[PDB]
Design a binder for these strands. Structure first.
Ligand SMILES: Nc1ncnc2c1ncn2[C@@H]1O[C@H](CSCC[C@H](N)C(=O)O)[C@@H](O)[C@H]1O
Length: 327
DNA sequence: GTCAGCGCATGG
DNA sequence: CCATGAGCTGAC
């Protein structure tokens, strides 16, 4: 993550819904805001959260009375993506994991917060011929909010990963905010090769397969794009090998392949997958964030998360707009 | 609960 | 034509 000197959000309160690892909390606390409630149902996600932050999040959001929830200024939520992702079956609102949005709307109507900050995958914007995005937009307008949305690739904001998400920001209509803007891009100066651990710590992750086929030669100069060097098996998900001189592919949570969830990379003559700590780094997490003791769950957790840096830049801008109140 | 072979929509 | 994806499904 990056360091913020001008703490634009001091004094405001927020809630962490679908908490996961607490990615929304790190970003917002770095700007001076305060957390007053959290909710996450996964047994193991709850353990890591407690380890790092010191409190257990409440359970199942679908059976919590919206009036119990504390008064807050910003609502944060990165709702489930399985029913909308391009890697799934695309069942949308007919999937029991696709209706979560409406519990958000339910909470919103009661607490009427100042800002609503949501985020999902790129295909969310195109699903069902744009109908799904329309439904979210109209419900927000009807509740008296303005809707601002955009798709941002992580490689444009300092982190070496091709990870495209859609961000949705909503301000209550009586605040009359007319100057919010999505952050401007810059040049990338860090590559996969700058975050790797020493060879002695990652020896156990090596894989020597006899069906390895090199289709491209290693490159000699860095570039901001995924460079594919080879394949194993039929070249499906988890069977593709890339260069450490380019950028990483999107990390996932339920993926397969011999190089499951992270993909394979050509490191010093060898082919291996990433270590959990190296995953933390490509997601923007600091080396002081304690990871889960079980390697298996650690990978799933990081693949469901958000990239800190992008959230930080957007949070600064939300505060700047709120603080501009001239005579 | 963990592991790995897979098969298709989307966007050029 | 060619490359990708906060996935699915069945095995133990
Ligand atoms: N009904 C429900 N109640 C609470 N949490 C739920 C839920 N259904 C799914 N979830 C949780 O929603 C999360 C979706 S992914 C969100 C990750 C989070 N932004 C982070 O910073 O890491 C997962 O942790 C999932 O277990």
């Amino acid at each position: 993550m990056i360091e913020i000197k001008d703490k634009q959000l001091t004094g405001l309160r927020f809630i962490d819904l679908f908490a996961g690892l607490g990615g929304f909390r790190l970003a917002l606390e770095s700007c001076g805001a305060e957390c007053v409630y959290s909710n996450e149902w996964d047994k193991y996600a709850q353990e890591v959260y407690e380890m790092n932050f010191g409190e257990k999040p409440e359970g199942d959001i679908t059976q919590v009375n919206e009036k119990t929830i504390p008064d807050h200024d910003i609502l944060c939520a990165g709702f489930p993506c399985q029913a909308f992702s391009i890697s799934g079956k695309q069942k949308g609102f007919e999937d029991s994991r696709g209706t979560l949005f409406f519990d958000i709307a339910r909470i919103v109507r009661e607490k009427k917060p100042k800002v609503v900050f949501m985020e999902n995958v790129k295909n969310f914007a195109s699903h069902d011929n744009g109908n799904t995005l329309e439904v979210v937009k109209n419900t927000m307008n009807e509740l008296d909010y303005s809707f601002h949305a955009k798709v941002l690739n992580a490689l444009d904001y300092g982190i070496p990963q091709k990870r495209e998400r859609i961000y949705m920001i909503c301000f209550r209509n009586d605040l009359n905010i007319q100057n919010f803007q999505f952050p401007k891009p810059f040049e990338l100066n860090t590559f996969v090769k700058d975050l790797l651990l020493p060879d002695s710590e990652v020896e156990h992750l090596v894989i020597d397969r006899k069906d390895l086929v090199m289709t491209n030669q290693e490159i000699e100069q860095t570039t901001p794009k995924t460079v594919r060097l080879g394949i194993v098996g039929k070249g499906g998900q988890g069977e593709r090998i890339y260069s450490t001189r380019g950028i990483a592919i999107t990390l996932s949570a339920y993926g397969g392949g011999i190089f499951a969830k992270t993909g394979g990379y050509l490191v010093n003559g060898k082919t291996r997958k990433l270590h959990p700590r190296e995953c933390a780094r490509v997601m923007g997490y600091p080396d002081s964030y304690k990871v889960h003791p079980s390697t298996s769950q650690a990978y799933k957790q990081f693949g469901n998360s958000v990239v800190i840096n992008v959230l930080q830049y957007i949070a600064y801008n939300i505060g700047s707009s709120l603080n501009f109140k001239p005579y």
